[PDB]
Amino acid sequence: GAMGSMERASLIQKAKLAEQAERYEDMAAFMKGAVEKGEELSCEERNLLSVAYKNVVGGQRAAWRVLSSIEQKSNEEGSEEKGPEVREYREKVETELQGVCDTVLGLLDSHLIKEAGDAESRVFYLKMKGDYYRYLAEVATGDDKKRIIDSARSAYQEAMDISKKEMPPTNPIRLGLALNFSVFHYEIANSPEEAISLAKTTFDEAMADLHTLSEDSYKDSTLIMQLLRDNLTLWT
Amino acid sequence: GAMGSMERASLIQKAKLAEQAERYEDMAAFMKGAVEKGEELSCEERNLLSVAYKNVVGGQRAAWRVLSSIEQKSNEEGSEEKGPEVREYREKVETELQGVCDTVLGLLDSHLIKEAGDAESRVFYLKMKGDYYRYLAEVATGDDKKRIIDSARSAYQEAMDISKKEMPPTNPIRLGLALNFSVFHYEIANSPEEAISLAKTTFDEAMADLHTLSEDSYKDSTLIMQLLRDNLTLWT
Amino acid sequence: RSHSSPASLQ
Amino acid sequence: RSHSSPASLQ
Ligand SMILES: N=C(N)c1cc(-c2ccccc2)c(CC2CCNCC2)s1
Ligand SMILES: N=C(N)c1cc(-c2ccccc2)c(CC2CCNCC2)s1
Ligand SMILES: [Ca+2]
Ligand SMILES: [Ca+2]
Ligand code: NA
Ligand code: NA
Known part of the structure; x- marks a missing residue:
């Protein structure tokens, strides 16, 4: 790996700098190098990994959706038959997205998940695994989509x-x-009722537990609860 | 070049798609390939070239400025002496920026400028040449900064x-x-008076010529005149 | 259109 | 801090 000659601590420091500079491809390369040092990641380091790749794949997903919309328009009834270009370029972006997802899943499988025994780390990595298979699912067509x-x-x-x-x-x-x-349930698995049920049960069980929290932990929890509420409002 | 096997028209079509997808590194690669086909560029094609590289170098410039600020802080009196990392990573971004500028200047020199005989094209390319040397100047230190x-x-x-x-x-x-x-005069050449004079003379001579313009041309001209006004307000 | 989780958590 | 020209012109 191109980062094999750089110190772990230096890779982590540079990932933090790249985040400040909004250089997320760099950030992801630095954290990939850090992971490949073979040591487990701290909480902060796990978050840096997640931030880097989520921003990278987020740009690719946004581009893929723009291109997919254009492509499907060009297949409508009454559309001038352009050439292979829209499909080709959507495929180019799609293949790069899949590569990023495969890279993240490779890091989790070699060997982040198997070395994660604490709940906070093991759940974080398994959620990541689900997320990056979900991004693969967003562009999957049917052959191995299932x-x-x-x-x-x-x-x-x-x-x-x-x-x-x-x-x-x-x-x-x-x-x-x-x-x-x-x-996942709502957008991928065609299970809106499961999505709505899970969101409402999650929200209500968190609500009943907020009283145990400090002001700082309260802010973190209610932030994500609001996203659950926002989806329920969209979905119902 | 990796784009040598793709049709000129397809490269132009894909540059337009990449712009829609906000995939400006792709856009620049496509337009570089189009330029390397060896034909002169139309007005629209010149604009696509400019958009692609301006967005690419714009991201690099923004990152370089974030990193340069951190670096200079770490050299202040009373700052904990970190390692070589901030400098190294600022240098990494700086070297990639210079590469992009060198690439653009290479396209203009081989052979866009020498084949441009109409004023609209020749001025557009010569302005581009000035701009990308100005971006190089922003990060230049003194040896060949002059x-x-x-x-x-x-x-x-x-x-x-x-x-x-x-x-x-x-x-x-x-x-x-x-x-x-x-x-350039204000930020690079330490000539604020020349900057202010040029901006005011330009603005006033355009103002006196607006009466000749259609509504659509009027909008284009006054848009850039407003930027001149905005700078005068900042500079005075 | 659904909101998913921010990258950084606890 | 100065404004420069947009990429696309006439
Ligand atoms: N560089 C980033 N994006 C982040 C770094 C960390 C982190 C920093 C120190 C220790 C552990 C985690 C984040 C999570 C914190 C943010 C504040 N509230 C509680 C959780 S996010
Ligand atoms: N894809 C882009 N960013 C652009 C393409 C073109 C262009 C499109 C057709 C012919 C020539 C130029 C731009 C300049 C026009 C925009 C409208 N007002 C007058 C000038 S900008
Ligand atoms: Ca362990
Ligand atoms: Ca000519
Ligand atoms: Na594909
Ligand atoms: Na340098």
């Missing part, structure tokens, strides 16, 4: 089981996991 | 001479050239 979807579901389900046993209902990792699993 | 600055000045000056002979005072290329030359 198996991609079941791979996302499996990872989210394992994370949910641990989080319910090991974390309180207000824990922000638990909340973000349930939020994203609910989006 | 020669970079004089390279920017020379290109802008040649463009100004043509534009004054060949274009009306409201012409948007002429206006954007004078705007950018005035920024």
Whole structure:
């Protein structure tokens, strides 16, 4: 790897600098190098990894959606038959997105997840696994679309089981996991009722646990609860 | 070049798609490939080239400024002496910026400028040459900083001479050239009085020529005139 | 259109 | 801090 000659601490420092500079491809390369040093990641380091790749894949997803919309318009009735270009370029972006997802899933499988024994780390990584299979599912067509979807579901389900046993209902990792699993149900798995049920149960069980929290933990939890509320409002 | 196997028209089509998708590195690669086909560029194609590289270098400039600020803080009196990382990473971004500028200047020199005989094209490319030497000057330190600055000045000056002979005072290329030359004077060449004079003379001579314009041309010209006004307000 | 979780958590 | 020209012109 191109980062193999750089110190772990230096990679982490440079990832923080790249975040400040909004240089998220750099940030992801630095954190990939940090992961490949072979040591477990701290909480802060896990967050840096997540921020970097979420911003990278977020740009690709936004571009893929613009291009997919143009492509489907060009297949409507009454549309001038352009050439292969729109499809080609949507495929180019799609292939780069899949590469980023495969890279993240490779880091989790080699060997972040198997070395994660604390609930906060293991749930964080398993949620990540679900998320990046969900991004693959967004662009998947049917051949292995079913198996991609079941791979996302499996990872989210394992994370949910641990989080319910090991974390309180207000824990922000638990909340973000349930939020994203609910989006999976609604947008990927064609299960809007499961999405709505999960979002409402999650919200209500967190609400009943807020009284145990400090002002700072209260702010973190209610932030993600509001996203659950926002989706319920969109979905109902 | 990786774009040598793709049709010119397809490269132009894909540059337009990438612009819609906000994929400006792709856009620049597509337009670089289009330029390397060896034909002159239309007005629209010149604009696509400019949009792509301006957005690419704009991201790099913004990142370089964030990093340069951090670096200079770390050299203040009373700052904990970190390691080489901030400098290293600012240098990384700086070297990539310089590469992008060198690439653009290479396209203009091989062979866009020498084949441009119409005023609208030749002024557009010479302004571009000035701009990308100005971006190089923003990060230049002193060794060839003087020669970079004089390279920017020379290109802008040649463009100004043509534009004054060949274009009306409201012409948007002429206006954007004078705007950018005035920024050069103010930010690069330590000549704020020349900057202010040029901005005010440009503005006033355009104002007196607006009466000749259609409503659509009026909107284009007054848009850039407002930038001249905005700078005068900042500078005085 | 659905909101998903921010990248950074607890 | 100074404004420069937009990328696209006439
Ligand atoms: N660089 C980033 N994006 C982030 C870094 C960290 C982090 C910093 C120190 C220790 C652990 C985690 C984040 C999570 C915190 C943010 C504040 N509220 C509570 C959780 S986010
Ligand atoms: N894709 C882009 N960014 C742009 C394309 C063109 C262009 C489109 C057709 C012919 C020539 C130029 C621009 C300049 C026009 C925009 C409207 N007002 C007058 C000038 S900008
Ligand atoms: Ca462990
Ligand atoms: Ca010619
Ligand atoms: Na594909
Ligand atoms: Na340098």
